[model samples]
Target: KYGFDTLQLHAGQFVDRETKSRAVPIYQTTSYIFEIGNPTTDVLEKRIAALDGGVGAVATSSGQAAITYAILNIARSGDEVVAASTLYGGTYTLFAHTLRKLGITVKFVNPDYLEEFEKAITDKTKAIFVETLGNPNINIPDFEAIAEIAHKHGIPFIVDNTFATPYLFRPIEHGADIVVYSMTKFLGGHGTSIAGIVVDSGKFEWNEKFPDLIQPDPSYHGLIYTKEFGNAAYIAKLRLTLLRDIGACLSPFNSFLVLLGVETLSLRMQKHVDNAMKLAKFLNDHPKVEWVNYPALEGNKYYELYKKYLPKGPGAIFTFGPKGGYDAAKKIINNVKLFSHLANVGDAKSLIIHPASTTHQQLTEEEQRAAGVLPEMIRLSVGIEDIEDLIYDIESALNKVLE
Candidate 1:
């Protein structure tokens, strides 16, 4: 009924959901208003869901907050979560340390081994988590295979689509029961705001195993989730309970900014990846560059998976190791005058960083390698800049570093 560009620009921006010939069969309760919300924030909340083809979504103050809520909503004390080892370092720490302190066991698995996920799940497992595009590694996981594993074990498949974004890929269409995003990146299309979202696909069959959904809520006047909200029970519970109690909801103004950024999502994405492909090729042959890691590169390890999942491009973000190793990597990042030196990605301007001493700095050496963070690795978030300028910036930095 709606094209991607049309939906991004008009989905929730216009006051047209309730009775303007628009529809969603997921919302089963009218008490949705009681769950923390506002005018602009509500539109953002609805827009993101529509963009992702999700049943519903809840926006958060930051990506970390959304990640916290996405897991905590289902897995409490004594519950378990199986996650990919290639998750972002901060997210890795959350599952390995913070969540562990909360009495939740997060089993980190190598997504390359398709059978590893199946072996990790036990009766205690509540969810299986993986990113559509890995953080620094830029690796692509087998979504259908992983989704099947999660379903076979009766757990929700939670996918972090922050890197891939809905413009390039939609996780729900690939059997993802729950999708998460760090909107501060690609979705916002700029570095102006920080936000996150958890979108439930409304396809999971909530059973007796989840007493929180099946049973009554003593916390909210004995309201049952599954009986009352049907397929929307998970997302409703997230907003009504976690979002309400934690108070990490996104601001209306930030939502407005993200909405603006989202309007040109596809347009920006094309440039982001188009520049990325050119940059990747430039670096791949550079004498000072030892290696590059991007899934879509022909003959690369994850090429086939990339074609199956992301035919448009393998995202604008990628990682590479300089010939001079860690020392040279840092020098290149420091020397880049045009590329912004920062921890964030998905900005309009090109970005550069050394993951070993920055984003993944918190993890131990062994832990860092597990997530594909190498000592010589320099990650790039290519922007919408002209290809000529972007290539010159890298060449300038590489020459300075290796000289």
Candidate 2:
């Protein structure tokens, strides 16, 4: 197997024969004139697929679109999807509200109780979804066990791996049939682009039960995906049908930016995890801090799970609450000198956010708790900056909160 660092830099890139360009050339056109694909976007998808050990990948405008397309590709209005309750806020809203409006029922269960997932599966269930490392909560689920449960029920196992990029864990290797990413996060390493990808393991058998892949499609002259593409059927259908019809394809320029960012992913992630661990520990020991949650921490409930799947580190993002609750959380966010107070994460720069007032503000108090967001919770996306500097900045901010 090629080292991650090597693959990240050279996996999908080839020397351009036309101009002998060593770097990936941006094919900035809306549509290909003769090839039906942009060179830059094609490379990005291929590189991501290679990294994830998937048969192929499809790129979308955003992580939300990537997930929407992944679900809709197989399950229709009458079908159902079972997902872990601890999901990104936007995803929870999409499943609980928006997708509900579209007639798709999503059953959200506690990942801690593996039985909850198996119990929720029904004949109409098309997919089982979970995050590699849950957003903000920083919890690590038993992915292999959940994958087995999904396969036993004949449903595809999907994982949102934005937080734990392939550098840390390859979901496909752990029995996940489909893997999705918000390339805007760690995969891109910088916050310069908004993109998502769907990687198909191509291991699931598209049997008669899943008629969407095995059956004829009137949209494309009754073409059957499984018969035509075999292992690549899922990704093929996603690219040809959902992406084609929905028009959420990533732009060539953004694809180029993500491609550039991916080059230093392995390097960036190492620093990110290192800094995050130190920061989590510092916050946990702070006199004014109420609680800190990070899977890598020894006291974290998911520490064992983290060691099982992500031995390198849990990730850069975690949540902590100060003693003063919401007011203290706000004070830290407002007073931090180095950590940016913003909604976005996975930047080279450290960032902070008050989830109750920002990311998870739309949900009810009960719903927020279920999703692992608390009124006092402050989400931190630790960056590749010096560990001591980050600790000092956070300490100074906490001092302001006390004052």
Candidate 3:
């Protein structure tokens, strides 16, 4: 296997067809000329597929679109899907509210409870979905167990690998058939681009069960994806059918920007983890902190799984609750000087947000608590800054709250 550093710099970005530019150049055209009846988008599609360890890839304008396309491709109206209870707020909202309204029912259950996942699956179930490291909650599921269950039921195991990225974790190696990434996150290391990628591992036999893919699509003039693309059936259908109808394709320029970000992903992610570990420890020791939850830290509930899956280090995001409750939580967020109080994570600069009041506000109190978001909880996304400075900022902020 190639080292993370090498993959980041050389994975998706290629330098050919244009006199060997060491850096990936922005292909600023809205549409590519069909040279030999193949468009430039085909090159991007192929490169993304290679980078993500899949048969093919479909790049979209944003992470949300990527996920939507993946789901709509299979779980259309009247279909059901089982997903982890703890998920990024956006994902939770999409599955719980939006998809439900669209006739796609998503059952959210405890990811640790294999029984619940199995019990939820039925004839209508099309996929089993989860995040590699659940956002804010930071819950790591038993991927192997889930994948086994999905395979036994003839469903594809889909994972959102945005937080873990391809560098820290390769879900495909562990039986994940579909992987999704928010290129806006670590994959775009600098957060300059808002793009998403969906990769198909080509392991699922769509023809055996999901004959819709094997048959001709009326939307695309009865084009049979499996027959035409072979191993790339799922990804090809996702792009040519879903993305084509929705028009959520990523711009060539944005793709170039994200490609640049991937180049420094390894160097940036290592520092992100290093700084996060120090901050997690400091918060754990702080008397003003009610609780600290970082899977990488010793004594954490998920430490064993972290070692097994993310042996290097958990990604930069973690959550902590303040002893002073909601008021103190708000005060701490407003008082932090070094960390920017923002909802988004995976940035070069530190980020802080109170999920209960911000990100998780849509969820009921019980729902929020079930996802480990207490009223006093604050989520921190540590950056690659000096560890000492980050802790000092937290210390000073805590001191102010106490006073």
Q: Rank the candidates by TM-score, best first.
A: 2, 3, 1
Best by lDDT: 2
TM-score of each: 0.92, 0.96, 0.93
The global C-alpha lDDT for each of the candidates, from Candidate 1 onward, is: 0.86, 0.89, 0.82
Per-residue lDDT of 59-154 in model 1, one digit per residue for the tens? 999989999999999888999999988888789889999999999999988899988988899989999999988866787989999999988888
lDDT digits (tens) for residues 1-403 of candidate 3: 7655665556555566757777665556654545611233345455556656788788888889888888888878889999998888788888989999999999988888989999999988999999999966898999999999999999999999988776678898888999988888887777677888788999888744576797888888888888888888898788777876778888777777776666677788888888988889989988898889999888888999999988878788898988988889988888889999887887789989987777778998888787777888898888888999999999999987862
TM-score of model 3 vs. true structure: 0.93
Span of ten consecutive residues with least summed lDDT in model 3: 36-45
lDDT of 2 by residue, 1-403 (tens): 7878888888888888889998888887665445435788989998999899889999999999999998988888888999988888788888999899999999989899999998899889999999988766777889889988988888899999999899989998888999999999889888899999999999999776689788899987899999899899999998888887888989999999999889998899999998998889888888999889998878789999988999999888999989997789888888888999999888999989998887777888898787667899998999999998999999988888863
- After superposing candidate 3, which stretches have Cα over 4 Å from the reference? 1-3, 12-20, 33-48, 357-371
* Candidate 2 lDDT score relative to the true structure: 0.89
